[PDB]
Every structure is written in structure tokens, then in C-alpha cells.
Design the sequence.
């Protein structure tokens, strides 16, 4: 059906259509042990879909996929909430597009329905082979699509493959103004034939339509990489700072990926079996070896380092020019007789010819080191190193090791880093070492991620959330990926930008990984 | 709905078997392969925007089914999708032309055929019937068919900012369409979809320098024409002058000629290039070996830029000397002719016997301008089957496969010093070997990405059946660079006049 | 009877639009893609000769149609054609296996399934009905289906003369066969027919001697095993080892001198090859530049055979002085290690500096070779994904490319000379770009007709998905030559263990 209206002033019209490019199959539910009805008011409540919205500009090419949504109870808030109580479901959905159009100049949209186990093409030409509808920007207000439930079974259990709706640009947008854009918004509600089947206790790990984040300012989150210095600032660096293998790597697949843990307090202490021998070059250095509790010394599959023991990094050409710092002490009955400051390398002096690695082979400036003795390691900071670049060195998984992979931000976006400051251990000694002030940056801390590790994440959607700080009102929108990096869209120069650390994170909506943020952080300073 | 010509329905009574179609193939929103074109203020009246034969190639599904069949009968229903605007004016004309009648090249004459005038203001959902005109019961392959022709009747004008109008065409067969005589699907009727394997340009060969890998693509506004012979291919072969599918083996040749020299230098010995086949030097086959470099232009001797190569005296298939030597391509100066392929080569070495055979391996130039000079290849005679000079359509620029040619040095004055340069190619045979089985529908061109790294940047160019790619994009700055880290992806078939909505700004 | 399991009527109630077939597809019987195999007295008891699914890929017209649809439901009627004679004694069994049931290795147990026994002397065609066994309303891709299994019920005690029986399968869809929702015809599925752009083998690239063209195909006693990893290309994983699709620009690597700790028995200068894919330093990625020479010179001494290469000193703009030198290859029995992994190389040139990034371009071999030296490549040592060592089945023998390597001479300034040698590669790579476009069925290899003289087919080869070709032979010679002026066409799938009917007599 169709319906046309005259706009105010009579300078155009707007259309509102209902279409069924129909598979159109209804199940009798003969094998369902019980058929569970719904509140009649759920069928009359059209809610925004997680995955919408998207914007169309003059630079948007045809053939690029703008939406890809599975037909399931997750399209509506109340069916998503209700579904946690049930075992199966059956029925189609009503999908409504809302086009903020005008008699701009021109352009067309195409929406198509795709059956399960069929690849989605990247051509507007091929989408016309599917059941579809076409729409014009000069007259489009709302298109309602009767999306069917395509299945070869009478009702669903969790884990099936489902049909999809795909939206694409059919003809490019045009207008006199270069800033004119068209925003598409999608809402959904179940069709009257929708039903649930079997009542079961709700799931505690339910992937819910709304994620609630308790008030916890960033400065309270501390710290996978420097767990002795409070977080006080948020950072935005624009030096192509793609994160190599670091600590604090958390994803909602595993918990902690790599040699990371949910208890990083201090700077995790480890010990070494300090055998030694001949050393060329430096005369004061001894080549010790690192022990591995909970990990066998002779298995490449597990990491050859204690869990939580990671960067401060090393391995640069100046690896022997720049030395790390540790509280070192010899092991004796009941504890450690003394705890002193010594220069440690944790690098690639002679034996490996490696880069920033994760041995299993650590070098020290101590000449007093003896073979038959265990020693303590509590890293503190740096000594003689540069700033802001030699802490974020680039290690990775070498050999047959399987660590966290290297990640980069998407084009047009940059990371945001939790930042802390390290004071300098300045000392006047006949024996002892100095230090240098340093800035330390870390990825998402487990205090905020652990909530996501429990609440859940819709599949294929990235969380969009705000950052509300001291009065007056100022909110910055970031995107929290399941892979565990929070990013922001930026414009301007490549300035290193500092953001406060007093504000609560607030969930806003579920968005696709490719979603342009309107709230940009103009890097001008 | 408009029917300029009535559709006469044929009862397939002489057909040995009548094969019915799936009833759902009569859904009329499938695009017409090649039924896409744009109009702008620059398009001249009388210009032909679309010329489609009325066959099963007008529909995505009948084009697929037709590979299984030997015969066909029926017509099509077309629909126009015009992305117009409120400020534009103009008209088009669509006409039906019978099978054995020529298409006129005037809109004045096109009005003599059954036709419809379409106004840009009221043509967004017009339906046209494309009939099947024949004097037989059904069609075989190789027939002569009627055509649909679309032309600009009144040019596009605007009362405000200039706007282009992109027009698309969708089709479905009429209820009287039928097929005949199942046959195995290895027939003609090139497929409506081309599946390109993902092979980045860096993994392809440069036929004009098959030892330096392709490093990047670039576009130059000055290079308005290409006249090369090496590295040129085609799908509607035919053939191309001296271009192989094995460019690496193409770059070795032998020469021999008796005593002689050039006027001003008794250091430039003559040498006639040997043929992979054998003489006579018939003026119907290439005079130079099937594999040979075009690294030369209209240079004249005397303080002249020259060519560098390796040479070696053949020894009973055994051991031969090899050293970098100089080489100029023909005595074009002494004949009043521009540099051409039929001239005998010269090598700057007095130590060469006259009855011996000498090897040649081109590797660079010396004392010469960079790419700008080797980009222009020598001339031809018009006496043998070679490749013509090709230019892009008005408002389109070439896309080339580019490689870097390093230099060679000598501490002594025994070898020769050579300078670096970037060698440039028009096409590679690795991108083509998959297009031969699929085919190209009726003089249409393919639109391709180029899904650059990350999937964020997507470029669009047009691959013609003549073996070159083009895209006009505003700007000077002759050198624009595109990474070779990417893969190709098929989008659609378009008419040659179709313009690309994506523009690669040449000023960034 | 021919139907021990009846076909179930599927009321396609849950199916959206139900799509019908041309009623003449139910009446044509076509060969089954991949339904071909052989039997002999050597066939091992209890083995499974054929294992097919009951998908639409069982018929030539349903597979082409299935590319246009999303689901299906039906059943097929099958026929076995046995090419035996009157001296053949034995019996076949063909059975239908429901999904989620394991196939037993005993013909005595197959009798519990719906089955059909068949004598080898039968000249007619035996019919079977293969129904679609489902608990669902219709099928999508990626399901679990029923199977047809063929086995030897009674062994062949027939061989008065050793004799192979060829068995072929033929199918047609039953009525009650239907398709479901119509979709554009583009799928990730091997085409039942493969069309090869006919190109003579001489117009192809030799990935182990790219500069010189191919001259012939040949068979030798070196067939016994293939270990090199430069002309290796698979159909499911693409290039493997250090193979490339452009071995005409993946050559010419650069080495960095170090001066090492040398023996050379005074002086042999060491060096290290540069690996641009830096993450390569680990044992998980290759230790050598992609597409670099893997010729052999081993094993014992390394003071009698040496490789040959051009070499130069890298400077500002490649202005490197180039001259012919020797070059050994890594670990030789006095530095104290096996032949070589890949990386470390030597050179017979004391002029190498400590860090000056020298070039290398392998040109030939010198010393005792004895081509048989070049056929065996260095060993593979580490944990990176090196190409395995492959061998042909009994009775079958490899077919290789082959090209000529001419020599070069010196006077005294380098002292190094090369020798005429022959270079062969596991056939590649221009023969595979078509296969990726078309694809290969699962578990099947391609049977070939190599056409040589005026269309008179003379030779037949098998092409495996692992990337090699074999032939059936008898005569045990080492110098069989096959011309490269012909072409080949497959369009035919057979099983492994399929004995080719055409035999190559390796005698005069």
C-alpha cells in the first residue's frame, strides 16, 4: 500500500509505503510443547534498532553496505528482554525506515532481504536480484518492510543462521549545498504471528539490550601497566600509536588475553635463577634466567614469563644505552635480606639478537650477582631513557608463541589512553642508581571492562558511550570495542591531547564498528 | 506504458520442445546489464547513450538460463529509473530499430522509427515494451536482432547549479518468453557476473619491465595517448602487435649484420635483429621479435640520449662474453622518418665481428630524460598487423602499472653508466586470464574496485575490452600515486559514455 | 527392485516461494561430475571406491540451476555403466547411507543398507533410486546429507590379462524435486565444467628459470620425489613455500655482507640475505626472500660445484657496478652444518665490505653439474610452513616443464664460467589462474587431453589439487621428450587411483 501527503507550503510531497517483498511463510507450531503469547502492547511499540543509524553524504558510493541486520528478537527492546526467559521463538518482524529527506536534488536507496547462508554482495546491480524496494530522496518519509522469518524448522533455538536486511545507496546523493546530508533511522516491532515457546529461568550472563555502568571515575581505575600510580589524565596521541603487544589486554571473549590478569597490583613481582657466565662489552653485567610459576619452563605454547610480568619494554638499538629499574634483593630463609635498586635490561644485549621480547632472559648491572641465588624483581621505571616513546616500544609474538595481536585504530579515528605519572627515584650515592620522570599509558583497565565481561555485547555492534565530567555540562562520545580499545574521532593537527579523568561512563547505544561520531575532538593545541 | 511497436506473439509450433521458465523470473526490478548511463550539460545532442540488442541478455536471470539453451522467443518489459532534480530540463528519445536496418547517426532520422520522447521532468517510472521482431518461429544463436537506441534529443540545462542525471534501466521478460532445446552450459552468452580472484597488482608482471615488480599505480594528465606494442592485450582477439603472455622470455634476442657504420661515428656497428620465426622479412608480420622493448622515442643521433643493453658473441651454444653496452634504436635520422621498429639496431662497440650473432638484454637508458621520454614508443609502417594509438574518452584519463628501473654504474670507462627511471605499462596479462572464460556483453565496459587497504578507501575505474583502464579526475600535478596493496572487485557493466561519481582529486 | 527406500513427499509448507523446474530436465540423463573410477584385481578389499552426496551437484543441469537458488529438496535416479567384458568375474555393491551413520569397511555389512548388486560382465545399465533423507522441510547449503557408496562385493579373479574396468555414473532428478528462493547467480562453489584458455606450454613462465622460455615437457627417473619449493601452487591455499605468481621480479634479492667467521681456505666472504618481511626473523616465517632461487649444488664437498650470479654494490640510486662472480649457498660441511636452511650465502670475491648491501641475481651454475644436481633442492630446516616433499603413485610419473640455460664466458678477470644445464619446474604458474577462477570439486582431480598434432589427441595427464601432473608410463627411461607446441583441455573430473587409459611408452 501507499500514502501521500502535501508538505507545508505545498513545495513537495512525502510518501509512506508498506511493502512485502515476500518470502511470507507462517508456522503452525505443531511440535511446540507450549505456545507462549505476548503482551498485546508489545506489538504496538516501535523501538529503535541497535545498529541504526547511518548517514548518507555526497561522498557515499553505491555498492557499499550501510546496514546488515539479522531478523531476530534482538531487533526490539521488549522481545530482546523477553527472550531471556524462553527457549525458542518463531515469527517475523516489521522494519521501518525513516528518511530525513527533502527535494534536495536527487538520489535513491535500495533495501533488500537476503535468505540464510547466502553471501551479501557489494554491488547495487546484484542487490536487484534479491527481493527489494527502491526509494527516492525527494519524496521518502517512511518505508515499512514486512520482514519474514525464513526457516526450514517450525521454531528456533539459539544458535541458528537467520535472514538479513541490507540497505545500500542505489544512486548518489546530490544538492547545491555541500553540507546537506540524509540521515536514515530504523525501528522495529514484532508481527502479530510472533510467538515464544518454552518458559525457562532467566540467564545470568544474558546479552541484554541495555548495559548499565556503575559510577566509577577513571582515576579509580588503576592499572594493568603501572599499578602504583593513580590514573589522573586521559590521553590522545596522534603519532600513529598503534598498540603493539601490551599488558592490560582484555576482550569479551576470554577475559585477559596474553599474560595479563585481573589482579595486576603493584608491578607484579617475579624472581630469577641467576646463573651467569662470560659477557662481552660490559664487564659488570650477568646473564640471569627467569623462572615461570604455573607455566612449564619447557613448553612454547604457554608464554615464557610469569603472568602479569610484561613491559616496561626494551630491545631498541639503545636497549643497552637505556636501562630499566627494579627493586632487587637476594632470597634467603624467610624472605629477602635486602631490597636495593639495580639497573635491569630485559632486552636483547647479546644472546638473542631479538627486539622487545618476552624472555626468559634478563640482564642486570649487578656484579655481586651469584649463581646459586634467587633474586627479586619489582620494576619501578627508567634510567637514562627518552620520554613518551621508549615505554611504548613495539614487541609482538615471536616464534611459536600465541599472544595478543597488534591492533590499530580505524581510518579517521584514534585511541584514547589511560595515563599515569611516575615520580623520579633521585638519589646521591657511592652505589645506587638515579631515575627519570616518565609518562605511562595503558589500555582498558579491568575495573570498567569487567562489567562488559558480565553484562554482554550484541554481536557485530560496538558500544557507544559518553563521558560526563564536572559541571558545567561537557560530554565526549567514545566507542568501546569488544577487542578492548576505546577510540574517538578526531580532526585537526596531530597534537598530543590531554582529557580529564573525573567523569562517569554512560552507555548510549549500540553502533556498528564503522560509525562516524558527530562529537569530534578538534586537536588544535 | 508505451508500445511503439506491437509485439507479435509466436506459437512455437515448429520447436521440438518448449521449455518453461520459473514463474518468479517475471519480477521486474532486475537491472539491465549495461543499462546505465549519465547525462550532463556537456553531452551533445544526437549522442548515443545506450544501444542494446533485444535478446535474453537484457535480464540477469534470462542471461544465466540462456547458457543452457539453443533457442529463444519473446520480448521484454523495461522500466526507467531517473534520479532527476527540480532545476533540470531536457529530453531523450528511445527508438526500436528492426533487425536488418542500420542505426542512423542523426536524431532527425531516428524520428522515422517507432519512438518515444521522454522529458526529464516526468520520466522516473516510464515503462517501455521492447518487442521481438522476426520472420521465423524462434531464434537460434548468431541471428541479427532488433535494437533499442537511446539518444539525447534536447540537451540538459539547469536554472541553478549544474547537476548530472544518472539513469538506470530494469527489465523482466513478457509472459510469452520461452526457451528451447536444452544444451550443456559451455555456450556463448557471456555471463552477466564476472568473478575476479583477489590478486594485488604487486603480484602481477610488468610486460615492459619483467624484472622490476609493480610498486604503484599512477595517473598523468599529459599522457593523453598510448602507442605501445609490448604489454597490450584484448579480449575480442584478434591479436596485438608483439605482446606475449610470457613477458620474461620475450626479453632476449639475437642480432647479426655485415660491416657498416653510422656517418659521424665509426663506433656504431649495424646489426639486424633475428626473428623467432624465420624470414622472408614479409611486410605482413612483425619485423622485430615477438618480444622486444619499446624503450625509445624520436631521438636523433649526435649528443643523443641512447639505450643500454647487454651483449655477447654467440659461441656454439657454449660460453660467451657479456658486458653492459650502449644501443640506439635505428637510424631514423638518416631516412627522414621518425623512430620506428623496422630500423636495424646499432651497438656502440667496434670490437664486434660481422658474421657473428650477438645477444641482447635491455636493462636501462643512459643520458636520457626520465619516464617522459620512454613513455612515447617508436612509430609503425601501417603494413602489418599491429596495435593502434589509443586515447581515453573525452574526460577520462589512463591508469598505468608502474615500476622502478634501477641504475647501473662503472668505475672504469669500459662498461657504461646508466641512470634510473620508472618504466610504465598499460596492462598486465595476469589481470586478464580470468576474463576470457566469462566474456564481455556486447561492447560494454566493466566498473571495478580497488578496495584499498582497510575497505575504507574504494576507487572506481573502467576496464575496456581494448585492454586499458581510465578515470578522469580534476587536477594538474602530473604525478598522482595509488598504492598497489589492494584487490580488484567487479561492480557492474556500464555504457562507455557513463561517468563515474567518484573523483580522485589530483591536488591532494 | 530398484527402490528399496521410497522418497518422502515434502509438503513445502515452511518454504517461501516454491520454484519449479523446466519439465525437460527430468528427462535428460547426464554424467555425474566426479562419478568415475576404475577397478582391478589390485583393488584392496573393503575399500570405498566412490562416496557421493545427494545434493543437486549430481546432475549437469541442476548444478547450473542451483546457482540461482537458496534451497532445494528432491531426489535422484542413478545409473551405473560398467565397461567390462566376458572374462571379468566379480560383483559390485551400491548402497544408500542415511546421514549421521558411519560407513562400514565390509561388503557383508553393506547388505543391511538399501543396496543393489551388480556383475562386472553386465552390458546394460543398472538403475538405483537415491532419495533425499531429511528431518527438515528443505535444504540449505552446508547441511549433512545422505550418501551413495560403491564397493567390491566379490573380488576380481579375472586377470587372464591384467585389465582395468572403467565405471561411470549417470543421474537425473526425480519428480518432487523443487528449488526455493531465487537469488543472483554468484556462489563460492566449483563449476562442474572447467574451460581453459588454450595456451601452448611454451608461452608460459618457468618459475625456476623465468628469463629463458619453456621448450618441452619431459619425464625422467628424477620423478621419484619433488622437494623444491619455487614452482609449488595449490588450488585451496594458493602459492606455498616461497613461490610467487610473478617470478619475474620476485628474483634479484640483495645481500648484506658481514665478513663473519670464514674458512674458505683463505677467504670465502660470507653475507646475509635481506628479508623485507621483517617479522621473518622468527622461525614461523620464511628465512629467505620470496621467489628466490632454490637450485641445488650439494652435498658433500662444495669445492667442485658452485652457483653463479651477478653482483653489485648498492649506492645512492642503484648506481652499482655489476660483474659476474661465483656464489656458494650457506652451510657446506666445513663451517659444520647440513646443506643449508636458505639464508646464509658466500661468494668468491674478497672485495666485499662489512655492510655494503650487495645485490645478487642468480645467472647459472658452474662445476660438475650434472643437471641431476639442480633437480634436488636444498633441505628445509625449521618450523615455518615449507612446502612438503611429494611423490607420485605407483605406475604414474611426474611431468615437468623444461628450459635451456646457456652459458657465459670469462677471460681472466673473473675466472668463473658457467655450463649449459637444463632447468625443470613442477608445472606452473599460468596453468593455475584459470583453476582459481573455475575451481575444483572436493576429492576429485582433473583428467586431461594434451593435443599435439593437428588436433590428434596423443597424450592424457592428471592434474592434482596439490599442484603437479602425472602420466601413466612403462619403459623406464630418463630422457622422454614431449613437444610444447600443443594445448590441453580438461573439462572432466575423475577420482585419484583412476588409471589413465592412454599409456606413454618410454622406449624409443
Sequence:
Amino acid at each position: 500500500s501507499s500514502k501521500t501527503e502535501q508538505v507545508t507550503g505545498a513545495t513537495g510531497i512525502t510518501q509512506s509505503t508498506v511493502t512485502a517483498p515476500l518470502p511470507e511463510a507462517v508456522s503452525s507450531l505443531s511440535l511446540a510443547p507450549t505456545v507462549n503469547a505476548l503482551d498485546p502492547w508489545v506489538y504496538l511499540n516501535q523501538t529503535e534498532v541497535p545498529g541504526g543509524t547511518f548517514t548518507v553524504s555526497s561522498a557515499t558510493q553505491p555498492g557499499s553496505v550501510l546496514l546488515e541486520l539479522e531478523i531476530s528478537p534482538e531487533l526490539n527492546l521488549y522481545t530482546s528482554h523477553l527472550f531471556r526467559m524462553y527457549a525458542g521463538w518463531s515469527g517475523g518482524f516489521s522494519l521501518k525506515l525513516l528518511v530525513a529527506g527533502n527535494a534536495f536534488s536527487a538520489g535513491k536507496l535500495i533495501a533488500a532481504i537476503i535468505p540464510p547462508n547466502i553471501e551479501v554482495p557489494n554491488s547495487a546491480y546484484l542487490l536487484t536480484g534479491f527481493p527489494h524496494e527502491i526509494l527516492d530522496f525527494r519524496t521518502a518519509d517512511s518505508m515499512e518492510i514486512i520482514a519474514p522469518d525464513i526457516k526450514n524448522i517450525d521454531y528456533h533455538f539459539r544458535g541458528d543462521k537467520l535472514g538479513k536486511l541490507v540497505v545500500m545507496v542505489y544512486s548518489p546523493l546530490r544538492s547545491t549545498s555541500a553540507d546537506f546530508e540524509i540521515e536514515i533511522k530504523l525501528t522495529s516491532a514484532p508481527l502479530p504471528d510472533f510467538k515464544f515457546t518454552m518458559l525457562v529461568p532467566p540467564i545470568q550472563n544474558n546479552a541484554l539490550p541495555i548495559w548499565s555502568i556503575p559510577q566509577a571515575p577513571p582515576y579509580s581505575m588503576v592499572n594493568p601497566r603501572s599499578p602504583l600510580t593513580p590514573v589522573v589524565e586521559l590521553y590522545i596521541n596522534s603519532s600513529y600509536a598503534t598498540c603493539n603487544h601490551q599488558l592490560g589486554r582484555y576482550t569479551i571473549y576470554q577475559g585477559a588475553i596474553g599474560n595479563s590478569t585481573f589482579n595486576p597490583s603493584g608491578a607484579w613481582t617475579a624472581t630469577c635463577t641467576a646463573e651467569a657466565g662470560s659477557v662481552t662489552g660490559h664487564p659488570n653485567w650477568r646473564y640471569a634466567l627467569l623462572d615461570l610459576p604455573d607455566n612449564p619452563t619447557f613448553d612454547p605454547t604457554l608464554p615464557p614469563v610469569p603472568r602479569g610480568f610484561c613491559d616496561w619494554g626494551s630491545g631498541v638499538k639503545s636497549g643497552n644505552k637505556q636501562h630499566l629499574v627494579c627493586f632487587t634483593g637476594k632470597k634467603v630463609e624467610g624472605g629477602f635480606q635486602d631490597v636495593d635498586t639495580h639497573m635491569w635490561d630485559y632486552g636483547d644485549n647479546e644472546t638473542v639478537g631479538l627486539d622487545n621480547t618476552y624472555q626468559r632472559t634478563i640482564y642486570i648491572k649487578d656484579p655481586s650477582l651469584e649463581k646459586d641465588a634467587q633474586y627479586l624483581v619489582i620494576p619501578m621505571g627508567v634510567s637514562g631513557a627518552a620520554n613518551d616513546d621508549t615505554v611504548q616500544v613495539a614487541p609482538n609474538c615471536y616464534g611459536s608463541w600465541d599472544y595478543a595481536p597488534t591492533v590499530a585504530p580505524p581510518l579517521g579515528e584514534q585511541f584514547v589512553w589511560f595515563r599515569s605519572q611516575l615520580p623520579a627515584s633521585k638519589t646521591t650515592t657511592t652505589s645506587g642508581v638515579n631515575s627519570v620522570p616518565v609518562n605511562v599509558n595503558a589500555l582498558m583497565s579491568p575495573d570498567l571492562m569487567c562489567s562488559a565481561y558480565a553484562s554482554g555485547f550484541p554481536l557485530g555492534k560496538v558500544a557507544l558511550l559518553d563521558y560526563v565530567l564536572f559541571g558545567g555540562s561537557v560530554v565526549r562520545q567514545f566507542k568501546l570495542y569488544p577487542e578492548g580499545y576505546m577510540t574517538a574521532n578526531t580532526t585537526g593537527s596531530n597534537t598530543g591531547f590531554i582529557i580529564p579523568a573525573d567523569g562517569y561512563f554512560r552507555f548510549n547505544s549500540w553502533v556498528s564498528p564503522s560509525f562516524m561520531i558527530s562529537s569530534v575532538v578538534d586537536l588544535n593545541l
